[PDB]
Each structure stands twice: as structure tokens, then as C-alpha cells.
């Protein structure tokens, strides 16, 4: 109600907007390195 | 209903500094968004800054390095700090809550800021006496006039506000001297003329100063 | 930072019609505009956002629409009240900004003002300088014509008028125009008059008095 | 912080007695209290080193005397230059702080006022504000009583007064009263009056006029 918010809101794309609204998606990639053994690593070094 | 007190505004010489402020009647300004914007006459409206409810700040280029916006919990008021300001900036400053998307819903009345070198001075003011011939009938209009005083503007009122019909006010208007002029005129029934004195109150906050002067019949053949 | 335009320059309509306002941009808003209500001497008042939302306290009167920086706002069945300047408001980036603004007035019928005149009072003499003011009040339009005659000389450069702001209830404009003299050229110079020329009259009126009369 | 309290209220006395003026702290201290005396809109002056040690250019009538937290201070043979108010300070630490002040009353005779009442000027109806004036002059006890009645109404709570402090040569005072209200509300009632209760009377008198009489 009136000073009751509902704490969302939505986006509403529409298609024929200009580019600048335009929905995009976003990949965010973190590295962390504690005093734990890494499990990745690079796959590229392999020669016959 | 909602309702926000503003506060501070008058005259400030360059290079100078000043805090205004603005007081909320019974919304929180700790909960919400707040904002400032800057409105001149002849120059258009402008949008300044804003804190958003994290207590973020963020503002327009215009006046960065030169302007900061607080909020006060411990009084539950928005402030507002002003440095080295310039001419352009002369204008009448607004609060007022947004919310989101930034609907501005609800304003205060706004109070102007004034920036000069020049000093305050302090207004004169000529009463009009009402002519015997504007008696001949229903109605009679009565006035007066304050001029000579620096800066704008000049809140006028008649008998404290007591009537609310029939009082017409004029702009101010600028001096070749620099400071400004104006005038009144209220609108009254014509039997209590001779019997009900009307006395006009003025108020000129910049220069917090005050001058009553009545308004009589008298007579004018003469 | 992004511009919008507004037209027209100037709206004028009668009681009773239907209002349309239009608001144009220099890139797209994706339909989040808003419009604002401001009556002189008084705070803006939200009306309406995006293309179509009303606000919670405005009437079903008001209605806008729009799309791809074109956006029109319509209003029908005008009230005397909904004269006012009009604002549209910027949501496409940071910072924001809103448009110059639009002015509406209203059109109800034309009426001739009442016309006063009144002399330099005693504190103005003493002092030094003296000034005269003729006052023009509850007329229409706002083009009023008025002059001054002194000593039957037409002095067009040494007077500065002043005008009124339109009272919604009557519809009716007022106008102040000032005379200022020095004492001497006060002292020198008897007879005064104003010649004033309106659409609400049916002939030009002209009123005068003579410094004599005190 | 260590607050002190001056005792009593006030001091009336006749010359040539002995004055006794009592203090006391919040905190018990060993004479680290002085006093300050003043003839109201002048210099105040120091009184008196410590508890009793006197300064050279005060006579011998004073004597102060301390305590642990009670201190009083003592003069005898009361003298009509004696006529002022009287305070403590601290010379101990806290930081130093002072007292609430004594005022001291030299008395001869009893005097009952002279009453006058005055109508308000053409300027004050001129301007929509009416008052009534009425004035007490050359009275002891300072405490004169005075009070308003309209239409035989009373009315004494629509004033604000002030009394001079005592005129060295006549042993009395005088006082200042208003009776102020709108002009309707002046022309509401018809005749104003004033009450005065003294004791140098064997009882209240009272002056009256009309509205009508100017």
C-alpha cells in the first residue's frame, strides 16, 4: 500500500527499445587461492 | 497530509559557504531516497544530487567539488552544504522524496538562494488609502506598496491571514539601483470600511524584517 | 546526458475540451517518462509515468501515451484549475534531467479591467524621488494596451509596467504599470494621463488627474 | 560540576543593621569561596579574600565567614551605598563555577504609589492596536501590586511589566504596566480601569475611564 513497498521491481524489456536498455546477461568469474590444493589448472601443454 | 519543513536560504557573497536543510513531518528520510534540485527562473529546472537509502551518494557534474549532501538521523533531517558558488547557480533549491524509478512523488514548497556581494538591505513600505469613490458600491479594493530592499522576495499578509478572498499580489520587479520592488491589494465588502481597518503584514526573511502599515478610508477630496 | 523537446511552445484551449500534449527525445526512454504538474507559487505534483500509469491522487481526466521517443499526453474534459506549466522527466541514463516545460491556458470570454490611478505618496517626496503607478486589474486577455501622457507630451521611456499571474477562478488577468519622476521633473510637470486601449472595452478609455489635485 | 545556592531569595533590611548572607555548595570544599558584588548596570566587584580575608578598598562592615559547605557572609552598620545584589563564586576547582545572586534592600518608610492612567495615542489607533497605560511611581515595598479591569472585568493577564531597581534619593520605585488588545476588542467593552493593592494604603485604589471620553 501507500509507504508499503514491495521491495522488486521488474525490468519490462521491450524489443524495439534502443541498445542502451537492452537485457544482457553477465558471467562473473572469481579465483580463489587458500592453503588448500588448486583443482584447476591449464589443459594446453601436450606434444607427441 | 505529508508534509516536509524546509529550512535555510537567503543571501550569500561568493567564495563564501552556507548548510541548508529540510525536516520531514512524519515520513523517514532515514529509509528512503532523498533528493535536491535547483530551479531558476528564466533558466530552467535542474536535477543536483541524491543519497540513496544505503546511504550512498551520487550527484551531477555541475556541482562537484562545490556541493555535499548529508542526512542527519540523530533529528531526523536532510541536510545540505554549499562551497564557492557562482552566479548562475542563483536559483530556488527544492526537497523532495523519490522513490525507484524516480517518480519525485511528494515536494517541499522550496526555499530560494540568492548569491551577491552586495549587502541585505531592508524593505520600505507605502500604504494606498482607498479613494471615497470605490465605496459607491459592493466592494472596494485596498493596497500598498514595499520597495527599495535587497534581495527577493517579500511575503505579504493582511490582517495575519485572517481573510482568504478578494487579496491579488504582485511580482517583484528589479531597480535600476539593484534591489527590487513589489505590491498588494485585497478585496473587501464596503459596509466596514469605515468601521474595520485592514492592516497588511510584511515579512522580509532574507533580511528577517517586518512592517506592519495600515490601510483608512481617510479622505481624498482634497 | 540526453535532450528532450516539447511542443507546443504554447497551449491554449477552452473549458470543457480535450487537451493533447506530445514530448519528443533525442534517444529512446522505453516508455519510462512521467509528467508533473506545477502551478505557479505552488510545488510540483506527480501525474503520471511511463506510458499510461496515473498517480494515485490525479482524475481519470489525465491521460498519456507513447513509445520509441515519441510520447503524448491527453486530457479532456478541461477544468479551470488544470492551468498550470507542464513537466515531462528523463529516466534513459545518469544524470537525469526533464524538458523545458509547457504552458496551458485557459479560454473563457473576454472582459474589460478597472482602471486606477494613484499619486506619489508624502514618504516618497520626502525622500527625494516620486513615482506614479496606474493600475489595470480583472481583464482578459493579457495583451492589455496602456499609455502615459504627460503635459500632453507622450513620455513612452521613463515608465515600467508590471503584470499579474491568471486567477484560475475568474479567468482574468491584471496589469501595474509605473510612472517614475524626479522631484523636480515631479514639481515642473502638472498634468498627467493614461490612455489605455483594451479588447473587453468598447472604446479606448483615458484617465488623468492633475498634480494640483495633491 | 559543583553548584552553589544563595540564601535567602532576597534581603530587605533598614540601613545601620547588620546584613547576613547565607550560601551553600553542592560539594564540601575548605574556603574556596569569595564574593562578588554589583549596583545593577555597572562593574561587578570583588568582596572578599577567601572566607574572611578583606580587600583593602572595602571597609571594615563586611565579614564573610565559611565553612566545610555552609557559607555566609555578614556586614554591619548598613549604609545607603550598600544598595545592590550579591554573589558567590568558586575559587576552588572543578572548574570554577558561581551562584545564583542576593539582593540587598535598604529600607526607610513605606510609601503608597502615584497612579495615573493614560488613554492610547491617535498613532497606536491609527494602526489597529490599542493599549492602556497605567503607572505606579515613588512606592515602597517593591511589591506593588497591580492589575487591569475592563468593564469591570479583570483583565491582568494581558500585560508584561518591569520595575526600576530603588531610587537612591526617595527610597521607592516605580513601575511600568500595559494593557494591550486589538482595536475590535477595544471597542468590544466600554470602560477600562486598573487596580492597585499597596500597602501603604489602608486599601486597593483604583482608576477608571470611558472609551468615550478620547
Known amino acids: 500500500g501507500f509507504n508499503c513497498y514491495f521491495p522488486l521491481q521488474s525490468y519490462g524489456f521491450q524489443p524495439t527499445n534502443g541498445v542502451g536498455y537492452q537485457p544482457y546477461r553477465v558471467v562473473v568469474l572469481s579465483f580463489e587461492l587458500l592453503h588448500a590444493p588448486a583443482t584447476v589448472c591449464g589443459p594446453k601443454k601436450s606434444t607427441n | 497530509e505529508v508534509q516536509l519543513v524546509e529550512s535555510g536560504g537567503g543571501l550569500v557573497q561568493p567564495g563564501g559557504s552556507l548548510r541548508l536543510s529540510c525536516a520531514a513531518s512524519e515520513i523517514t528520510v532515514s529509509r528512503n531516497y532523498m533528493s535536491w534540485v535547483r530551479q531558476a527562473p528564466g533558466k530552467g529546472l535542474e536535477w543536483v544530487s541524491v543519497?540513496?537509502?544505503?546511504?550512498?551518494?551520487f550527484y551531477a557534474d555541475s556541482v562537484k567539488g562545490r556541493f555535499t549532501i548529508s542526512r542527519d538521523n540523530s533529528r531526523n533531517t536532510l541536510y545540505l552544504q554549499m562551497n564557492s558558488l557562482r552566479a548562475d547557480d542563483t536559483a530556488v533549491y527544492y526537497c523532495?522524496?523519490?522513490?525507484?524509478?524516480?517518480?519525485?512523488?511528494?515536494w517541499g514548497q522550496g526555499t530560494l538562494v540568492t548569491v551577491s556581494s552586495a549587502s541585505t538591505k531592508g524593505p520600505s513600505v507605502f500604504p494606498l488609502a482607498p479613494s471615497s469613490k470605490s465605496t459607491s458600491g459592493g466592494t472596494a479594493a485596498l493596497g500598498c506598496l514595499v520597495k527599495d530592499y535587497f534581495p527577493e522576495p517579500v511575503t505579504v499578509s493582511w490582517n495575519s491571514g485572517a481573510l482568504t478572498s478578494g487579496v491579488h499580489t504582485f511580482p517583484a520587479v528589479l531597480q535600476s539601483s539593484g534591489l527590487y520592488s513589489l505590491s498588494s491589494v485585497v478585496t473587501v465588502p464596503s459596509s466596514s470600511l469605515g468601521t474595520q481597518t485592514y492592516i497588511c503584514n510584511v515579512n522580509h526573511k532574507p533580511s528577517n524584517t517586518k512592517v506592519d502599515k495600515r490601510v483608512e478610508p481617510k479622505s481624498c477630496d482634497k | 546526458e540526453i535532450v528532450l523537446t516539447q511542443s507546443p511552445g504554447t497551449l491554449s484551449l477552452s473549458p470543457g475540451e480535450r487537451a493533447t500534449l506530445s514530448c519528443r527525445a533525442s534517444?529512446?526512454?522505453?516508455?519510462?517518462l512521467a509528467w508533473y504538474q506545477q502551478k505557479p507559487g505552488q510545488a510540483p505534483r506527480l501525474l503520471i509515468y511511463?506510458?499510461?500509469s496515473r498517480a494515485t491522487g490525479i482524475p481519470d481526466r489525465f491521460s498519456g501515451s507513447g513509445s520509441e521517443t515519441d510520447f503524448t499526453l491527453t486530457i479532456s474534459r478541461l477544468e479551470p484549475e488544470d492551468f498550470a506549466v507542464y513537466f515531462c522527466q528523463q529516466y534513459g541514463s545518469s544524470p537525469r534531467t526533464f524538458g523545458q516545460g509547457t504552458k496551458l491556458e485557459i479560454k473563457r470570454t473576454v472582459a474589460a479591467p478597472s482602471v486606477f490611478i494613484f499619486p506619489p505618496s508624502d514618504e516618497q517626496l520626502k525622500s527625494g524621488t516620486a513615482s506614479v503607478v496606474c493600475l489595470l486589474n480583472n481583464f482578459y486577455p493579457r495583451e492589455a494596451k496602456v499609455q502615459w501622457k504627460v503635459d500632453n507630451a507622450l513620455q513612452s521611456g521613463n515608465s515600467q509596467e508590471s503584470v499579474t499571474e491568471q486567477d484560475s477562478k475568474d479567468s482574468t488577468y491584471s496589469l501595474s504599470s509605473t510612472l517614475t519622476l524626479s522631484k523636480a521633473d515631479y514639481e515642473k510637470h502638472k498634468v498627467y494621463a493614461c490612455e489605455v486601449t483594451h479588447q473587453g472595452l468598447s472604446s479606448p478609455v483615458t484617465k488623468s488627474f492633475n498634480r494640483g489635485e495633491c | 560540576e559543583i553548584v552553589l545556592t544563595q540564601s535567602p531569595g532576597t534581603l530587605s533590611l533598614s540601613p545601620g543593621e547588620r546584613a547576613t548572607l547565607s550560601c551553600?555548595?553542592?560539594?564540601?570544599?575548605?574556603?574556596?569561596?569569595?564574593?562578588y558584588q554589583q549596583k545593577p548596570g555597572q562593574a561587578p566587584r570583588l568582596?572578599?579574600?577567601?572566607?574572611?580575608?578583606?580587600?583593602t578598598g572595602i571597609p571594615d562592615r563586611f565579614s564573610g565567614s565559611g565553612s566545610e559547605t555552609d557559607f555566609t557572609l555578614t556586614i554591619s552598620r548598613l549604609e545607603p551605598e550598600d544598595f545592590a545584589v550579591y554573589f558567590c563564586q568558586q575559587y576552588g576547582s572543578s572548574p570554577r563555577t558561581f551562584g545564583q545572586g542576593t539582593k540587598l534592600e535598604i529600607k526607610r518608610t513605606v510609601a503608597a504609589p502615584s497612579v495615573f492612567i493614560f488613554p492610547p495615542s491617535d498613532e497606536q489607533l491609527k494602526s489597529g492596536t490599542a493599549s492602556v497605560v497605567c503607572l505606579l511611581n515613588n512606592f515602597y515595598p517593591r511589591e506593588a501590586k497591580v492589575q487591569w479591569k475592563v468593564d469591570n472585568a479583570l483583565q491582568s493577564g494581558n500585560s508584561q511589566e518591569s520595575v526600576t531597581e530603588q531610587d537612591s534619593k526617595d527610597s521607592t520605585y516605580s513601575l511600568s504596566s500595559t494593557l494591550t488588545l486589538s482595536k475590535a476588542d477595544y471597542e468590544k467593552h466600554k470602560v477600562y480601569a486598573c487596580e492597585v493593592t499597596h500597602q501603604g494604603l489602608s486599601s486597593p485604589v483604583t482608576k477608571s475611564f470611558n472609551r468615550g471620553e478620547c
Open positions: 523532495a522524496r523519490d522513490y525507484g524509478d524516480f517518480y519525485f512523488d511528494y
Open positions: 511511463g506510458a499510461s
Open positions: 534517444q529512446s526512454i522505453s516508455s519510462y
Open positions: 543519497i540513496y537509502s544505503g546511504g550512498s551518494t
